[PDB]
């Protein structure tokens, strides 16, 4: 019963592991594989409330926080909404952050679009809905 339950969410897990890996792995995306460094960075900790990055989503991962694809999702979205709003100027470092950090975004929905079958995300909807 609750063991059917943990192999549905093991199976998660897996998957999105691969996802984040193969993000991971993209040199467009390097900037976005680790948390900001407050001493290049110093204000970046007062104006983004919730900072986000791919080892983030590792950890998050493992702590199973992420009971559902929806959630995952929602972590990926703050990576490239973060930096919308950290670098919003139209200076050409700027641009360049915003359209990586939002290809990343696009990169992570098209894969799970193309792989991941809807009856497992909906199960694992369902399973949560219940706890």
Do not use: W
């Amino acid at each position: 019963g609750p063991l059917q339950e943990e192999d549905t969410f093991r199976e998660l897990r897996i998957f999105l592991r691969n996802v984040t890996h193969r993000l991971a792995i993209d040199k467009r995306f390097r900037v976005f594989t680790k948390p900001v460094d407050p001493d290049e960075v110093p204000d970046y900790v007062t104006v983004i409330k919730q900072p986000m990055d791919l080892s983030s989503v590792i950890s998050k991962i493992d702590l199973h926080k992420y009971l559902t694809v929806k959630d995952y999702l929602r972590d990926i979205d703050l990576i490239c909404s973060n930096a919308l709003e950290y670098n919003p100027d139209r200076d050409p470092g700027d641009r360049l952050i915003r359209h990586r950090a939002c290809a990343l975004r696009d990169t992570a929905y098209a894969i799970i679009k193309e792989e991941l079958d809807e009856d497992f995300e909906q199960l694992c909807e369902e399973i949560q809905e219940s706890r």
